[PDB]
């Protein structure tokens, strides 16, 4: 067929992909910023095609629910034909394999603990022995689905706590649990991906610390439908990519160059 | 077709696969132990296949010779159809992903600098900038050709310098490099993947140590011939493996529980 402009699904989550200050009206990919920003245009010139960010309708990352088995988010809309591609922090995960393909990671990640600064926690076992400090996960993501599925007994404690607090500790994005970190002196500590953290560690106020080490070892990675004729070239422009050094020249751009904590 | 014995090329490097102790007149599997011996068993149980470990021939992890276009070591027995898949510290590359198929990562390294303790070396710049301190890769690896093709100015200086140093400040083995740190004098560093490098430190006599942070970041994966049947199991095997947890308990089993140095 015809070259066709390729729709990239991907999501309002800083630093990653950012809306331009008053770039609200303007038009296409120029309106926004961020280290998937970048990315997407280096993979486009490597695998020669055209295209145009679109923000995922939902909001949301990507879940099956238990119910209609229907995938929401990013996930959704390349499983349901919506989208070409996600370039995005989205998780590589087992059940996600299953339904989408992921190339090779471009970002590795763990889930880890965000406290606001003086919260007398230092790691998941001390969240998982008391219960004056509420903890949650953002909703319809791998960290939530991480924890509904483990059984490690330290995690499967925890989700037991989680998935019947109240009120809910779950959020509907990331700004949000790091707004209830911030406001709830020391009584809410947010459980998200360790990029995040590292990257919200460094923005003003400087109030919220990452502690401990990471609870698993994963990575982000680009997302075609199943059995896509793009999959392949992708593939390859992340390891390129990741040799030329040019992934790790983006995260400092994105993460530490622009810090305002020092 | 019957189900047939699927045909393991790995490689003797500690402590991912290692004779036991008086094992070398037995037969079979039961030879062998380390963290890629507990990962075969997993995978194939996984996948449900039986398997027969062999250690690769020229001893070699896999590059392309310059002149013949050949392929060499593990790689080589996948090209060439000697084995069914490399179950092994085998580097995800550019370069190998174009002529085998690579599982999603099962462990993470980067490069990293190896010194006698006492070194006066911090960082790759620091090896850079001097000449009293020789340094150098294994052969036939992804660390040497990491080097022969980077662009980056501080290891592009590198290579220039190994290159053409007198004599080869190149190693056979792993075990041959760290052999040439430890009786150096501190006059040698060696550069080996992270992995390696922490698993050295804590072996007797404990007299090297890893120093600076990683000049790179990357993986091994489980590698299959090119559109192989046993490559989709085998790439969902390793997330959920993942994702148990399973991955991290061998490398504490294999890394740091075996730990003799305190
Ligand atoms: O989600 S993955 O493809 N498989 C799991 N791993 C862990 C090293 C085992 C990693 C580690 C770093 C990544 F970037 C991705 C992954
Ligand atoms: O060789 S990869 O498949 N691609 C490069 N990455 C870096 C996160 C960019 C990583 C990071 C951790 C891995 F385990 C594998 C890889
Ligand atoms: N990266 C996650 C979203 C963030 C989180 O769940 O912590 C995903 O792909 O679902
Ligand atoms: N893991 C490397 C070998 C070790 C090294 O090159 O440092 C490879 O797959 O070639
Ligand atoms: C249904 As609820 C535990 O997220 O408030
Ligand atoms: C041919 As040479 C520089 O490895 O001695
Ligand atoms: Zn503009
Ligand atoms: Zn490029
Ligand atoms: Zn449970
Ligand atoms: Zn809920
Ligand atoms: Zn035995
Ligand atoms: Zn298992
Ligand atoms: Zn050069
Ligand atoms: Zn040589």
Redesign the interface.
């Given at each position: 067929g015809a070259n066709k402009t390729v729709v990239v699904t991907t999501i309002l989550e800083s630093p990653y992909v950012m809306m331009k200050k008053n770039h609200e009206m303007l038009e296409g990919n120029e309106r926004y910023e961020g280290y998937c920003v970048d990315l997407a245009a280096e993979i486009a010139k490597h695998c020669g095609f055209k295209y145009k960010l679109t923000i995922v309708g939902d909001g949301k990352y990507g879940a099956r629910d238990a119910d209609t088995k229907i995938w929401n988010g990013m996930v959704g809309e390349l499983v349901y034909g919506k989208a070409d591609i996600a370039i995005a922090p989205l998780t590589?995960?087992?059940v996600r394999?299953?339904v989408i393909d992921?190339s090779?990671?471009f970002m590795?990640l763990g889930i880890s603990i965000m406290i606001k600064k003086g919260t007398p926690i230092e790691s998941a076992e001390d969240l998982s022995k008391q219960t004056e400090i509420a903890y949650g996960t953002l909703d319809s993501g791998s960290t939530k689905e991480?924890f509904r599925?483990?059984?490690?007994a330290v995690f499967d404690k925890m989700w037991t706590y989680m998935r019947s607090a109240e009120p809910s500790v779950f959020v509907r994005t990331t700004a949000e649990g790091v707004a209830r970190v911030r406001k709830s002196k020391g009584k809410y500590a947010y459980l998200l991906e360790s990029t995040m953290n590292e990257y919200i560690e460094q923005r003003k106020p400087c109030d919220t610390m990452k502690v401990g080490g990471n609870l698993?070892?994963?990575?982000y990675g680009i997302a075609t439908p199943k059995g896509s004729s793009l999959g392949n070239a992708v593939?390859?422009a992340v390891?390129?990519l990741?040799?030329?050094?040019l992934?790790?020249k983006l995260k400092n751009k994105w993460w530490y160059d622009k810090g305002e904590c020092g």
């Open positions: 590589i995960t087992y394999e299953e992921f090779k990671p590795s991480f599925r483990s059984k490690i698993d070892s994963k990575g593939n390859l390891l390129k990741s040799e030329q050094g992934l790790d």
